[PDB]
Amino acid sequence: LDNLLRPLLATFSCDCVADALILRVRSELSGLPFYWNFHCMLASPSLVSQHLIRPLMGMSLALQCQVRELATLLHMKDLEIQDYQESGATLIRDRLKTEPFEENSFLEQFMIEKLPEACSIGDGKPFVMNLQDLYMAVTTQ
Amino acid sequence: MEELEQGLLMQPWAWLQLAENSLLAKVFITKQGYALLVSDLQQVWHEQVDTSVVSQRAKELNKRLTAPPAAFLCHLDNLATFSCDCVADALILRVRSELSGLPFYWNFHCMLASPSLVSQHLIRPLMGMSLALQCQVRELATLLHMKDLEIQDYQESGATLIRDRLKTEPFEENSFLEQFMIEKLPEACSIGDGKPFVMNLQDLYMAVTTQ
Amino acid sequence: MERKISRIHLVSEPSITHFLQVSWEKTLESGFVITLTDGHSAWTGTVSESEISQEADDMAMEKGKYVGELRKALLSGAGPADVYTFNFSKESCYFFFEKNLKDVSFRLGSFNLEKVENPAEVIRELICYCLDTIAENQAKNEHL
């Protein structure tokens, strides 16, 4: 089962009896076929708590801290570029000039333009690609 | 009613101080009734009530000096002493408040919230906000690389730094994610009592609920 | 022994000034006798300490705080933000009185009343008292 799943994580079928989700594998082993069925009852809200929500809250706030510190880094690089122009008495090619960073505008524009796609749930595909590392780390912490 | 629900869905989270513990709540009040959701950051509960239940229950809990349910609803909007009990799963929130210049009392008989709405209110929203936050981090990072391009443009030709304390190391995500993991991830990801969430993230919460 | 009389208007009688007289021993909580009139007829009722306890403990309130409120309402201790309102039916001899906040009324208490058989006698008594009261302040002002 492990050798089959780790690559993918053979064909699969899933069905939900009233509450439980039932997962069926069609595959082969030793040339011979192997059939197994998964019988997954709706998970517990302590399990839901610990595996999704509390970690997912954790995601949200940790990335908030990410944004805060990265915004302040933006401001410090603004200070460096200002030191370059106002007193450094030097210019550039004028093709790389960047606007001084402010988080309020940045946020308004992110939420006006990018947010409709930034928060998209989708298939859970982007979730399981982009942050599972942070997922793991915060589970550990 | 369903307006109560949809508004609640857009309602951000408050944070509650009980004498026993802390709580987080999102509530949608109208003159028609209320839409609440409460959690202790391990479990969630739900209660939905209209003015008839409001009226009868207030009468039982609070009797004379009587009024329109909407008046109580208004005072609840004002938003006192909070207590609760997890009778079997009816987390019965017991609130003593001051209404009409006098002691008030209500019980929110908050049963465990439903997995559908639980998705609807935390997980789907939480997942949404976390992903939006990652998009924000990516965009701030590309901005910092634009800035790194601009600074390196100065560094290739003259442009000596005057203030010997304004130096910034070139921005590369991986190492800073690492230092975030080591130095400050523990303090950051600490769940605590739900206070930081109600403090800082409600903007994004309401935004993600809208989207 | 404290007496306190108050010019009032029942909602049923906007143009009639009614007069609320209160007599009590330093303490409205201990119980009091109440008399209402309108210049042609008068009524009297009575309330006890335990009645006030029961009222205040159905107010969800500390007794005494509700007593201060009562001082405001019946002994004219009401302030500018205070808007009490009084209702009485002469046919039923039932009084009650309320408090106006949130564009709404809140019945504070309510008394069983009875019409007095001798309105003119209580009237003479009240107004003799009042005359005396007047006169005192007059003399005081003179000296001052």
UniProtKB/Swiss-Prot annotation, chain A:
Entry-annotated residues carrying Phosphoserine: 49, 120
Record-annotated site: Leu-lock: 32
Outcome following mutation: residue 102 to A: Does not affect ability to repair double-strand breaks (DSBs). Does not affect interaction with XRCC4
Recorded consequence of changing residue 91 to A: Impaired ability to repair double-strand breaks (DSBs). Does not affect interaction with XRCC4
Processing and modification events after translation: Phosphorylated by PRKDC at the C-terminus in response to DNA damage. Phosphorylations by PRKDC at the C-terminus of XRCC4 and NHEJ1/XLF are highly redundant and regulate ability of the XRCC4-NHEJ1/XLF subcomplex to bridge DNA. Phosphorylation does not prevent interaction with XRCC4 but disrupts ability to bridge DNA and promotes detachment from DNA.
Sections of the chain in a coiled coil: 45-87
Record annotation: effect of changing residue 33 to D: Does not affect ability to participate in V(D)J recombination
Tissue expression summary: Ubiquitously expressed.
Domain of life: Eukaryota
Effect of substituting residue 34 to A: Does not affect ability to participate in V(D)J recombination
UniProt effect for mutating residue 96 to A: Impaired ability to repair double-strand breaks (DSBs). Does not affect interaction with XRCC4
Documented effect of changing residue 28 to K: Does not affect interaction with XRCC4
Consequence of changing residue 22 to S: Does not affect ability to repair double-strand breaks (DSBs). Does not affect interaction with XRCC4
Consequence the record notes for mutating residue 49 to A: In 6A mutant; abolished phosphorylation; does not affect ability to repair double-strand breaks (DSBs), possibly because of redundancy with XRCC4 phosphorylation sites
Effect seen on changing residue 49 to D: In XLF-Asp mutant; phospho-mimetic mutant; abolished ability to bridge DNA
Compartment(s) of residence: Nucleus; Chromosome
Something else known: Was named 'Cernunnos' after the enigmatic Celtic god of hunting, the underworld and fertility.
Stated family: Belongs to the XRCC4-XLF family. XLF subfamily.
Domain notes: The coiled-coil region mediates homodimerization. The Leu-lock (Leu-32) site inserts into a hydrophobic pocket in XRCC4.
Protein name: Non-homologous end-joining factor 1
First-to-last residue of the parent protein present: 76 to 224 of 299
Swiss-Prot record, chain B:
Ranges in coiled-coil conformation: 115-157
Positions bearing Phosphoserine: 119, 190
Recorded consequence of changing residue 106 to A: Abolished ability to participate in V(D)J recombination
Mutagenesis / variant outcome for changing residue 104 to A: Does not affect ability to participate in V(D)J recombination
Keywords: Chromosomal rearrangement, Chromosome, Coiled coil, Disease variant, DNA damage, DNA repair, DNA-binding, Nucleus, Phosphoprotein, SCID
Similarity-based family: Belongs to the XRCC4-XLF family. XLF subfamily.
Illness association: Immunodeficiency 124, severe combined: A form of severe combined immunodeficiency (SCID), a genetically and clinically heterogeneous group of rare congenital disorders characterized by impairment of both humoral and cell-mediated immunity, leukopenia and low or absent antibody levels. Patients with SCID present in infancy with recurrent, persistent infections by opportunistic organisms. The common characteristic of all types of SCID is absence of T-cell-mediated cellular immunity due to a defect in T- cell development. Microphthalmia/coloboma 13: A form of colobomatous microphthalmia, a disorder of eye formation, ranging from small size of a single eye to complete bilateral absence of ocular tissues. Ocular abnormalities like coloboma, opacities of the cornea and lens, scaring of the retina and choroid, and other abnormalities may also be present. Ocular colobomas are a set of malformations resulting from abnormal morphogenesis of the optic cup and stalk, and the fusion of the fetal fissure (optic fissure).
Gene Ontology MF terms: DNA end binding; DNA polymerase binding
CC annotations in GO: DNA ligase IV complex; DNA-dependent protein kinase-DNA ligase 4 complex; fibrillar center; nonhomologous end joining complex; nucleoplasm; nucleus; site of double-strand break
Superkingdom of the organism of origin: Eukaryota
Reported impact of residue 41 to A: Does not affect ability to participate in V(D)J recombination
Tissue/organ expression: Ubiquitously expressed.
Protein species of origin: Homo sapiens (Human)
From Swiss-Prot, chain C:
Places the protein is found: Nucleus; Chromosome
Result of altering residue 58 to R: Abolished interaction with NHEJ1/XLF
Effect of substituting residue 61 to R: Abolished interaction with NHEJ1/XLF
PTM: Phosphorylations by PRKDC at the C-terminus of XRCC4 and NHEJ1/XLF are highly redundant and regulate ability of the XRCC4-NHEJ1/XLF subcomplex to bridge DNA. Phosphorylation by PRKDC does not prevent interaction with NHEJ1/XLF but disrupts ability to bridge DNA and promotes detachment from DNA. Monoubiquitinated.
Residues bearing the modification Phosphoserine: 53
Renumbered residue ranges of the record's region Interaction with IFFO1: 1-144
Tissue and organ expression note: Widely expressed.
Outcome of swapping residue 55 to R: Abolished interaction with NHEJ1/XLF
UniProt family annotation: Belongs to the XRCC4-XLF family. XRCC4 subfamily.
Disorder cited: Short stature, microcephaly, and endocrine dysfunction: A disease characterized by short stature and microcephaly apparent at birth, progressive postnatal growth failure, and endocrine dysfunction. In affected adults endocrine features include hypergonadotropic hypogonadism, multinodular goiter, and diabetes mellitus. Variable features observed in some patients are progressive ataxia, and lymphopenia or borderline leukopenia.
The name this protein goes by in its record: DNA repair protein XRCC4
Lineage, highest ranks first: Eukaryota, Metazoa, Chordata, Craniata, Vertebrata
Gene: XRCC4
